[PDB]
Amino acid sequence: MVGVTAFGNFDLASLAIYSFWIFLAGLIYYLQTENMREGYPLENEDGTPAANQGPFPLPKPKTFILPHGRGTLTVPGPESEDRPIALARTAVSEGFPHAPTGDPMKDGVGPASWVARRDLPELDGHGHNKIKPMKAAAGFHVSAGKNPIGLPVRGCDLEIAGKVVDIWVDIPEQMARFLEVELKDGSTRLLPMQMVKVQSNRVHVNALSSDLFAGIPTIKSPTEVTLLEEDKICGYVAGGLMYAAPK
Amino acid sequence: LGYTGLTDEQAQELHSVYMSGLWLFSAVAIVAHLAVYIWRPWF
Amino acid sequence: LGYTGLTDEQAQELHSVYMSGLWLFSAVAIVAHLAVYIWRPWF
Amino acid sequence: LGYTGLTDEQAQELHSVYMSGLWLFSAVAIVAHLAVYIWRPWF
Amino acid sequence: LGYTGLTDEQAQELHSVYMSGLWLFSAVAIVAHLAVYIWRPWF
Amino acid sequence: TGLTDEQAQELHSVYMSGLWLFSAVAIVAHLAVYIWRPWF
Amino acid sequence: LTDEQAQELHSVYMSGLWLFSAVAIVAHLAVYIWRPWF
Amino acid sequence: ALLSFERKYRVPGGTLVGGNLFDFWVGPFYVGFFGVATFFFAALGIILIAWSAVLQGTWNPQLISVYPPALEYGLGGAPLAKGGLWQIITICATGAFVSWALREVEICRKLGIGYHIPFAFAFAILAYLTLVLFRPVMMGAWGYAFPYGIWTHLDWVSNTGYTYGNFHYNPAHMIAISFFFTNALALALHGALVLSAANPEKGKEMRTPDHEDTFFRDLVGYSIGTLGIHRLGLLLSLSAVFFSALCMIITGTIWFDQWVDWWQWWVKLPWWANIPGGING
Amino acid sequence: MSKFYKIWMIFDPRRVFVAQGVFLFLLAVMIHLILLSTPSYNWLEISAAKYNRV
Amino acid sequence: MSKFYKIWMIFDPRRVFVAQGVFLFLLAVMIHLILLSTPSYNWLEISAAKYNRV
Amino acid sequence: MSKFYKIWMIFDPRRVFVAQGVFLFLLAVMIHLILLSTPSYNWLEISAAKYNRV
Amino acid sequence: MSKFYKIWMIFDPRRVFVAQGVFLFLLAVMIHLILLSTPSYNWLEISAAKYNRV
Amino acid sequence: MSKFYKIWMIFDPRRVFVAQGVFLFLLAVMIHLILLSTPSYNWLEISAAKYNRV
Amino acid sequence: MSKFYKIWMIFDPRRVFVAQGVFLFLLAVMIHLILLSTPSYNWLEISAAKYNRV
Amino acid sequence: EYQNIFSQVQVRGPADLGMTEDVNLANRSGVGPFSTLLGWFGNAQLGPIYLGSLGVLSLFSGLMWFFTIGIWFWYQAGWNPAVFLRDLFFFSLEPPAPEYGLSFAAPLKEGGLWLIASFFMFVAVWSWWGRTYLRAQALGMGKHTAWAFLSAIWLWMVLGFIRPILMGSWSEAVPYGIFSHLDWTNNFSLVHGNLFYNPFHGLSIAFLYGSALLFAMHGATILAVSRFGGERELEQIADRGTAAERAALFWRWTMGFNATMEGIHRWAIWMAVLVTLTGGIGILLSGTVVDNWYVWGQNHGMAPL
Ligand SMILES: CCCCCCCCCCCCCCCCCC(=O)OC[C@H](COP(=O)([O-])OCC(O)COP(=O)([O-])OC[C@@H](COC(=O)CCCCCCCCCCCCCCCCC)OC(=O)CCCCCCCCCCCCCCCCC)OC(=O)CCCCCCCCCCCCCCCCC
Ligand code: BCL
Numbered sequence A: 001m002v003g004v005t006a007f008g009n010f011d012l013a014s015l016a017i018y019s020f021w022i023f024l025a026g027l028i029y030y031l032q033t034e035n036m037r038e039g040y041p042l043e044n045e046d047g048t049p050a051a052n053q054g055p056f057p058l059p060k061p062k063t064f065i066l067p068h069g070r071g072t073l074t075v076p077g078p079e080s081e082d083r084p085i086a087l088a089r090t091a092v093s094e095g096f097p098h099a100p101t102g103d104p105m106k107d108g109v110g111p112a113s114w115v116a117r118r119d120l121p122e123l124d125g126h127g128h129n130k131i132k133p134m135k136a137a138a139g140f141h142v143s144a145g146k147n148p149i150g151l152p153v154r155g156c157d158l159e160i161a162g163k164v165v166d167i168w169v170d171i172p173e174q175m176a177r178f179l180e181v182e183l184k185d186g187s188t189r190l191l192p193m194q195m196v197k198v199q200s201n202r203v204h205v206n207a208l209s210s211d212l213f214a215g216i217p218t219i220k221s222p223t224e225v226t227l228l229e230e231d232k233i234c235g236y237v238a239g240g241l242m243y244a245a246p247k
Numbered sequence B, C, D, E: 001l002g003y004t005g006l007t008d009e010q011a012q013e014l015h016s017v018y019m020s021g022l023w024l025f026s027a028v029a030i031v032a033h034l035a036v037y038i039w040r041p042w043f
Numbered sequence F: 001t002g003l004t005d006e007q008a009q010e011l012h013s014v015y016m017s018g019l020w021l022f023s024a025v026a027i028v029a030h031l032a033v034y035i036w037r038p039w040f
Numbered sequence G: 001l002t003d004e005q006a007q008e009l010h011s012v013y014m015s016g017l018w019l020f021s022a023v024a025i026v027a028h029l030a031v032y033i034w035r036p037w038f
Numbered sequence H: 001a002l003l004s005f006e007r008k009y010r011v012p013g014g015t016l017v018g019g020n021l022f023d024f025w026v027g028p029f030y031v032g033f034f035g036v037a038t039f040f041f042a043a044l045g046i047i048l049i050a051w052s053a054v055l056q057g058t059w060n061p062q063l064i065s066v067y068p069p070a071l072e073y074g075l076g077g078a079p080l081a082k083g084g085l086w087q088i089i090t091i092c093a094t095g096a097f098v099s100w101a102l103r104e105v106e107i108c109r110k111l112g113i114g115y116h117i118p119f120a121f122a123f124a125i126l127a128y129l130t131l132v133l134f135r136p137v138m139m140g141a142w143g144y145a146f147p148y149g150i151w152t153h154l155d156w157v158s159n160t161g162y163t164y165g166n167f168h169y170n171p172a173h174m175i176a177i178s179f180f181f182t183n184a185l186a187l188a189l190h191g192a193l194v195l196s197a198a199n200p201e202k203g204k205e206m207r208t209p210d211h212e213d214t215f216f217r218d219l220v221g222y223s224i225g226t227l228g229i230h231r232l233g234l235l236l237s238l239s240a241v242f243f244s245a246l247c248m249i250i251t252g253t254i255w256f257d258q259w260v261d262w263w264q265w266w267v268k269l270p271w272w273a274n275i276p277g278g279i280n281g
Numbered sequence I, J, K, L, M, N: 001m002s003k004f005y006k007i008w009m010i011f012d013p014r015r016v017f018v019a020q021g022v023f024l025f026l027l028a029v030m031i032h033l034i035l036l037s038t039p040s041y042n043w044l045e046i047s048a049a050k051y052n053r054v
Numbered sequence O: 001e002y003q004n005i006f007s008q009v010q011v012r013g014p015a016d017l018g019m020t021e022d023v024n025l026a027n028r029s030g031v032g033p034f035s036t037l038l039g040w041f042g043n044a045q046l047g048p049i050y051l052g053s054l055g056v057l058s059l060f061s062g063l064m065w066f067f068t069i070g071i072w073f074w075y076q077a078g079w080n081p082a083v084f085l086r087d088l089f090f091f092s093l094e095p096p097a098p099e100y101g102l103s104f105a106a107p108l109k110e111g112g113l114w115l116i117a118s119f120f121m122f123v124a125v126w127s128w129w130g131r132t133y134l135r136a137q138a139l140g141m142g143k144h145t146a147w148a149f150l151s152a153i154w155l156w157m158v159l160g161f162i163r164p165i166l167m168g169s170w171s172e173a174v175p176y177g178i179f180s181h182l183d184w185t186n187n188f189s190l191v192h193g194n195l196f197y198n199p200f201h202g203l204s205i206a207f208l209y210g211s212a213l214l215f216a217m218h219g220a221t222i223l224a225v226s227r228f229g230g231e232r233e234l235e236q237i238a239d240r241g242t243a244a245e246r247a248a249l250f251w252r253w254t255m256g257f258n259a260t261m262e263g264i265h266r267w268a269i270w271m272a273v274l275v276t277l278t279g280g281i282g283i284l285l286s287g288t289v290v291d292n293w294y295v296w297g298q299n300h301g302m303a304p305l
């Protein structure tokens, strides 16, 4: 087949390359439409459906069957925030920022945002809670790192804010997920493990000043944490990076 | 045994239709081979 | 015994049908080899 | 033993059938080697 | 007191059967080497 | 390892029996090879 | 390993080391007699 | 315009240069100070590629080529028609890449996320600068960089590689290739696993991360985890790029001969160098 | 031989049908390509030679 | 012999039958390829040379 | 043979049978390929030589 | 000697038997291949030369 | 002396047995290969020369 | 000696002993290979010369 | 300052034996040892591993392939361990010489042993593919891993089996050696003009670079949003959280379009299977359709006439 052309210079290699261009266009279309299952239709800055929606049509709905009897999820579907947003427009035209009306960290907007996830704990394959305090976990112990239990906790203002009391552990993955910090008033807060630096004599939290530790959202059950509470805690701690820049 | 949920009668009927199709396909193939062998034998 | 859930009669019947199929396949293969050996022996 | 869950009688029967199969396979192999050695000895 | 869970009698019996198999294998190997050495010595 | 003193002694006794058997076989083999074809 | 246990393991290790060194010295002296580099 | 959840995240802050100036969006894109810089540099570079095509005399996009200055210009300037357009386009590309990374930093700190993405991109920027800036400067001429053409920079790759014989005898090159192949294999495995857990057999519930761990432990006896697989992906990609940059930085500067001849230090090691057998003996 | 119908109790008819269709098509295409590859049994070239088309 | 039927209480017929089908088809293809690869026993060129078709 | 039947009290029969099938088939293919490799004992080529096929 | 049976109280017989089978087969194959690679003790070529097979 | 048995208190007997079996086999194979590579003590070649096999 | 016994308070004994054994064996192998390289102190070659093995 | 690259605290608990959907538990092993070194980066637990019929078949065939190549290497060294260690990376099992065609009559030293090794490798690879499929099926998961592996197998089969048959010679296939198959790669490029001008070669390189690009982007994104539990993606698919939204908005504000927590994995799997698929096609076309890729490029507007 070396040099056999049907027309012009078109041989099996030209046929292959053009077939691949057609296939690649189709594949890109499919991948984009599959990516369009969250966040659509596009909205105006006042919440109404935008005039423009894009070059790709919305895909047909598909349903996920959630485990442990948690229900089903059909996407794309009607998506609503289900929480108030304390933001005001800075401009009548679109494309400009929305300024927070009150305290952004308490209101949960900007880098301090959180999502209204399910108010149930995450489960493992057997139905138990995924995340447990190491005390309630059976047979779990610190293996090879610096053990943070008993270390003081220092905020971004170089001031002591509390001490580490427990470690919250992801049982199936066998990794530490949260540090439980006791404050001065004898109350405990959860700190994401990815947001603290465990040093030789202390645990340092760069995102959060010492006074802001009391403002961390609390868990309503001392033994478990839900997805919604995790959103609130992680969003608060991360919003501290922008909203605690002074002091 | 029923690993598929079919009963005995259902399996018999499905196999009867499948064998009808198989024999039709085989008859067409036999005629094609006869034509090719007459046109250009390979033995 | 309890490995597959088949009883003794079920195993006997399945093996009978399997052996019928095996002998049919072997007979076809034997005829094919006889034809090839007559056409072009390899010994 | 608790190693496979078979009893003594079950092991004896399974080994009897396995040895029947092994001797059949070995007899076929012996006949094949005899034929090849007569056709073309390697010693 | 066995880490494998075998008792003393079980270990003795298993070793007896294993040694029977080992001696059978070794006897076959010895006969094979004797035949090869008579046919074509390597010393 | 969890072994007691008596267990270690008994295990070492059997291990040394095996080691001496292996060494005796090796010694006989080397004697045969050296008589057949010395390397010194 | 505490002090006494570590010291005992030390002593047995050096007993092994000296036996090995003795065999090595026997071998080296046998070589020197049989074929010397000196 | 906006995604269903986008509004609560668009807040006034996180800029490095400027303030409310340039703190706005154009459609979906965020355009800070470095957004303006990126747009200017990219547009200028693209229009200069088109003008080089005009000067060259071809309109076939596969035949357009912008060649660096000849070796006799050294590290100085060159006429626009001969080597200078390549230099201006290189400056525009460097500016566009750096401004893109800094724009990503601004977006990261507006959203409150870590700076892993601009760092990973800086790795690729450094590989580009190794090929186009550092190696030409050490070798003493802009003419050792590659041209800006779809198929002519492949000619640069081939000529540079075959200057030193077969180029995949370079050892850092071997390490980089192994990292690239392992990265592609890991990307395939990871995408397939997450998709297989989220899209089980028809009519079944979604699988859990326990099922993913179980699948890989059954297959190969080890599961690295989710955090582990993402760490491994970042590290494999960055290691591949780092070793490619290294193998090119040492090529015309420390090494000067066939790399297959480099592999002879092992063979000529004294305590087996003269043993008569095998391939090298 | 008269009881081969019981194969459908252990095999899913849909999977068997899909696999059989794929297998038969691939086999037929492979045989036709092998025939076209050989200088003999390339029916186009030998029709050309027979009918004096250059 | 005469008691080999007992193998079916040990092995699942579905797995055995799929494995057997795959094995038999692969063996047939392998032997046919071996025969085609030899200059002899390649029936296409044998027929071509016998009838003077090249 | 003597008391070898107790090997089934140690090993699952299914796994043993599968290992035996795999081992025997691979060994047989290897030996046949070795014979085909040797210029003698390649039955196809010596049959070709005997009947002047090539 | 007499106390060697106690090895089965440390080693699982299943794992030991599998490892021993693999080891013995690989050793036998290696020795046979070494003999085949040697111009003498290559029984195929020795029989070829004795019987004038080539 | 007479108290080396305490090493089995320090090392798990199964791990040591596996490691020393592997080590012994590899050492023996390495020495046999060394002897095979040398023109002298290659018992196959010198046996061939003694009995005029070539 | 003086107080070197305290290293076992820091190191696991198994790791140290395993590393020591591996290092010793590798050292001895390397030195023997070095001696075998040069014609001097190559016991296999000087024995061949002495007894006229070539 | 903590970048989540290495864990700073490590914990251990009871070993996780795994799920039991309808896996035959008798074919699983026990759990192996925990490794602290691996636990610094990922999971510490080793095992258990599933071994079944296909596991046995794949292990036997792969071990035989490895041992065949190794014994050939030992033969090429003259049975000398020093030469074996010196000339390792220089030994090679070569396929039969070009004058033997596709026949199986090549001697053991001149390519027959290569055929034996190739048969063992063929069995090992295909049984491993079947094993991936069946391990997915036992847990009730989709077969995405099997299809991606099928893409890899496609390129491997074209290199070693399909292309040599179409070219009519086993000598076209790849030898079994470290430096020898690199030499084969270089000579394959030289013989067929310049493989850079193979368009499917270019597409394969585009998708390999794209795999590195997309994997770096995705690893960095997940590590960046791991402060919100973004690594738990299977749950972020079922219940979208602030991590997924922040990642989507980063990429939307950067390049104007984004993915989802599942669509990104669709992009990933396709980006890798495409490098291997296009590579297989490009190699299949070389020598059978195009003998000189540079001249082909000249005739197709890719190189100057
Ligand atoms: C001709 C050119 C133009 C053609 C068309 C142009 C028209 C416009 C473009 C149209 C194409 C758009 C493509 C988008 C499809 C989206 C696929 C997807 O990801 O998910 C959807 C869908 C299922 O999605 P899901 O929601 O995740 O399902 C989960 C299930 O619940 C439970 O899970 P599951 O059990 O159902 O399995 C899930 C899997 C299901 O996916 C599959 O089933 C794939 C089946 C294998 C591919 C078929 C070829 C294999 C070889 C033939 C032998 C067996 C045939 C298949 C047997 C079928 C049995 C079912 O779905 C996936 O997501 C897989 C992702 C990655 C798949 C990678 C496939 C690698 C193939 C390797 C090829 C090896 C030989 C190549 C030879 C040369 C070919 C050029 O999957 C598919 O449909 C797979 C599509 C397979 C395409 C094969 C590649 C074709 C190559 C052609 C290149 C162009 C030609 C160049 C040369 C020309 C020479 C002349
Ligand atoms: C002088 C050399 C030539 C050249 C000659 C070739 C040739 C020839 C080929 C490539 C191929 C490829 N080349 Mg090129 N290549 C050159 C220059 C380049 C440059 C460059 C910067 O210059 C780059 C980036 C590349 C990149 C690439 C890849 C995109 C592609 C291989 C895909 C892959 O993953 O294969 C690696 C993956 C596999 C081979 C799949 C393996 C799958 C099997 C199933 C794995 C089994 C494992 C086995 C059992 C072992 C078991 C191990 C144990 C289990 C541990 N080449 C020049 C022009 N290149 C290939 C290609 O597709 O070309 C179109 C190819 O064949």
Ligand SMILES: COC(C)(C)C/C=C/C(C)=C/C=C/C(C)=C/C=C/C(C)=C/C=C/C=C(C)/C=C/C=C(\C)CC/C=C(/C)CCC=C(C)C
Pocket (backbone or CB within 6 Å): B001, C010, C013, C014, C017, C018, C019, C020, C021, C022, C025, I003, I004, I005, I006, I007, I009, I010, J020, J027, J030, J031, J034, K025, K028, K029, K032, K033
């Ligand atoms: C290189 O090596 C070369 C190629 C030269 C030569 C080497 C050859 C050697 C190595 C290969 C050896 C091959 C041997 C092992 C081949 C063995 C073949 C046997 C297995 C043939 C078996 C055939 C079985 C047939 C197809 C049976 C069909 C019967 C079925 C249809 C039975 C199913 C019927 C239904 C009704 C079952 C349902 C029963 C009810 C009760 C549920």
Ligand SMILES: COC(C)(C)C/C=C/C(C)=C/C=C/C(C)=C/C=C/C(C)=C/C=C/C=C(C)/C=C/C=C(\C)CC/C=C(\C)CCC=C(C)C
Pocket (backbone or CB within 6 Å): C001, D010, D013, D014, D015, D017, D018, D020, D021, D022, D025, J003, J004, J005, J006, J007, J008, J009, J010, K020, K027, K030, K031, K034, L025, L028, L029, L032, L033
């Ligand atoms: C390079 O080296 C070369 C290749 C040249 C030479 C080297 C050769 C050497 C290394 C080869 C070694 C070969 C091996 C060691 C030979 C082994 C052969 C084996 C032992 C053959 C065994 C066969 C046994 C089988 C065939 C028997 C099967 C019969 C069963 C299927 C019967 C059914 C089972 C019953 C029904 C079980 C049910 C009973 C209970 C009660 C339910």
Ligand SMILES: COC(C)(C)C/C=C/C(C)=C/C=C/C(C)=C/C=C/C(C)=C/C=C/C=C(C)/C=C/C=C(\C)CC/C=C(\C)CCC=C(C)C
Pocket (backbone or CB within 6 Å): D001, E013, E014, E015, E017, E018, E020, E021, E022, E023, E025, E026, K003, K004, K005, K006, K007, K008, K009, K010, L027, L030, L031, L034, M025, M028, M029, M032, M033
């Ligand atoms: C390059 O080096 C060359 C190759 C040139 C030369 C080097 C040679 C040296 C380095 C090779 C060393 C080889 C090794 C050391 C030789 C090993 C020989 C083995 C140990 C022989 C063992 C044979 C064992 C037989 C086959 C086993 C039979 C097993 C029985 C059938 C077990 C049955 C147990 C069941 C039935 C009952 C037990 C359980 C119930 C409940 C009581």
Ligand SMILES: COC(C)(C)C/C=C/C(C)=C/C=C/C(C)=C/C=C/C(C)=C/C=C/C=C(C)/C=C/C=C(\C)CC/C=C(\C)CCC=C(C)C
Pocket (backbone or CB within 6 Å): F010, F011, F014, F015, F017, F018, F019, F022, L003, L004, L005, L006, L007, L009, L010, M024, M027, M030, M031, M034, N025, N028, N029, N032, N033
């Ligand atoms: C290139 O350089 C060359 C090769 C030329 C020279 C280099 C040579 C190398 C460097 C020299 C290496 C020498 C080595 C270290 C020699 C040492 C050999 C000794 C250690 C071998 C010992 C073998 C002992 C074995 C055979 C004993 C086996 C007996 C057991 C199997 C008995 C069973 C144990 C059961 C019964 C335990 C019962 C426990 C119950 C619960 C009480």
Ligand SMILES: COC(C)(C)C/C=C/C(C)=C/C=C/C(C)=C/C=C/C(C)=C/C=C\C=C(C)\C=C\C=C(/C)CC/C=C(\C)CCC=C(C)C
Pocket (backbone or CB within 6 Å): J030, O066, O067, O069, O070, O071, O073, O074, O115, O116, O118, O119, O121, O122, O156, O157, O159, O160, O161, O174, O175, O176, O177, O178, O181
């Ligand atoms: C210490 O030494 C011992 C002996 C213990 C072990 C040492 C082992 C070491 C030295 C071995 C190292 C092996 C390495 C170098 C393997 C290298 C492999 C290379 C890198 C492979 C690269 C490409 C090969 C691929 C593309 C091959 C694909 C071939 C398949 C497609 C085969 C197709 C199947 C056909 C040809 C079989 C035909 C036979 C008949 C029955 C159909």
Ligand SMILES: [Fe+2]
Pocket (backbone or CB within 6 Å): H190, H194, H230, O218, O222, O233
């Ligand atoms: Fe991911």
